[PDB]
């Protein structure tokens, strides 16, 4: 007794309503956005890359890295559903399973441990936990992971900033602001290292 | 086979809704704004040019450099469609192609390779790659190219500032901030060389 067609449409329209929530919480969008935010503030440029471009890059990146799970949903939950092979209730479960598996690969056991105790449910295996518990654990792990990557990328720009300030202080020109002179070198290092292609490749490879 | 009048209208309104995205992700708007962002940051003025006029000049600059491609879209796609020479499906493809060609002229081979492997698809010719994968490669190349131009624009202003600081220190006045003295010199040398006209030539002509 699968859900009637009227209820099936009502469920799907509700999922489209929560589409921003699914992208910003259940996907890779948050980690990429935060790492780009740290990198932008690491250099002297405040909002030169602009917010729309940063989100635009992240949206394409989060679509590419989640193409495997997106295809797995299609090949196991959409095509059997359209071919009249699985109950609509079964198809919904078949779509949710790869999404849960992907979120578990990028989560930390400490995050699961605190939220499982917070929910107060007696579950032992770290695979049959509810989405209500998994999603906050996943987004917490993504924020912490983004900070680690953000600190990693920040260090070389801190090195340049300290060197420029030290060299200027060596000549006794303490009045000269190190930030104005430091910025072209920060652009210099990031461009001869091929930073933009490098960071997006690492962010793509990070989700594994 | 061809889309009905009702459906064609729906597609037209949809592209108008995404019009800001097409400007800042497919056209030359991103490179111009980033380069102009460096120019404002290089000089001692922080918000003095203000954000409004920079975007407005960038929009007019884009319409100038996108005029060949926009006219090519007009001739190849709009004119047969208005005269009812071709169907809506092929007219849409005839409009998409000039945009794809322009994005290929402003991208790099390495950037395309990274994203085509990232998408996990099969292709052998760059000319028939999907626009969904070309867009992230296009802007990534645009950001790297803009940083290169901005770095070159930042050097002469760094040159002026370092000279003024050295002169003041050499004269013995270790108490005066170089920024106040250097700012008129940076502005004077920006005007008597007609700096913006030179930047227009190296920015508008950089696409070709």
């Amino acid at each position: 007794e699968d859900y009637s067609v009227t209820l099936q449409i009502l469920a799907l329209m509700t999922m489209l309503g929560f589409l921003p929530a699914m992208v910003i919480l259940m996907t890779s969008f948050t980690r990429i956005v935060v790492v780009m935010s740290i990198l932008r503030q690491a250099m002297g440029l405040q909002q030169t890359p602009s917010n729309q471009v940063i989100i635009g890059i992240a949206l394409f990146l989060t679509f590419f890295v989640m193409s495997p799970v997106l295809n797995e949903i299609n090949d196991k939950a959409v095509q059997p559903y359209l071919n009249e092979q699985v109950t609509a209730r079964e198809a919904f479960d078949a779509a949710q399973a790869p999404m849960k598996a992907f979120m578990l690969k990028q989560t930390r056991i400490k995050d699961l441990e605190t939220f499982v105790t917070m929910s107060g449910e007696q579950v032992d295996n770290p695979e049959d936990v509810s989405m209500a518990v998994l999603i906050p654990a996943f987004i917490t792990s993504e924020l912490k992971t983004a900070f680690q990557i953000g600190f990693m990328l920040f260090l070389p720009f801190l090195i340049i900033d300290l060197v420029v300030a030290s060299v200027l202080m060596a000549m006794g020109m303490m009045m000269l602001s190190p930030m104005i002179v430091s910025l072209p070198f920060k652009l210099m290092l990031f461009v001869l290292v091929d930073g933009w292609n490098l960071i997006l490749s690492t962010l793509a490879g990070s989700f594994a | 086979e061809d889309y009905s009048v009702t459906l064609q209208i729906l597609a037209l309104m949809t592209m108008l809704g995404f019009l800001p995205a097409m400007v800042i992700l497919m056209t030359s708007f991103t490179r111009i704004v980033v380069v102009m962002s460096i120019l404002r940051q290089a000089m001692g003025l922080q918000q003095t040019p203000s954000n409004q006029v920079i975007i407005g000049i960038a929009l007019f600059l884009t319409f100038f450099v996108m005029s060949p491609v926009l006219n090519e879209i007009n001739d190849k796609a709009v004119q047969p469609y208005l005269n009812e020479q071709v169907t809506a499906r092929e007219a849409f493809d005839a409009a998409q192609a000039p945009m794809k060609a322009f994005m290929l002229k402003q991208t790099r081979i390495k950037d395309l390779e990274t994203f085509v492997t990232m998408s996990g698809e099969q292709v052998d010719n760059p000319e028939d790659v999907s626009m969904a994968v070309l867009i992230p490669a296009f802007i990534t190349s645009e950001l790297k190219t803009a940083f290169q131009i901005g770095f070159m624009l930042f050097l002469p202003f760094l040159i002026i500032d370092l000279v003024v600081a050295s002169v003041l220190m050499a004269m013995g006045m270790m108490m005066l901030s170089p920024m106040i003295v250097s700012l008129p010199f940076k502005l004077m040398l920006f005007v008597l060389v007609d700096g913006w006209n030179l930047i227009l030539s190296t920015l508008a002509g950089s696409f070709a």
Partner: peptide, 21 residues
């Protein structure tokens, strides 16, 4: 695949409109 999902949906709507007209 998933990309063709949107294409199929639009074609069905176009076919339904074409038959209705």
């Amino acid at each position: 695949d998933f990309n063709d999902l949107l294409t199929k949906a639009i074609n069905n709507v176009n076919t339904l409109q074409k038959a209705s007209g």
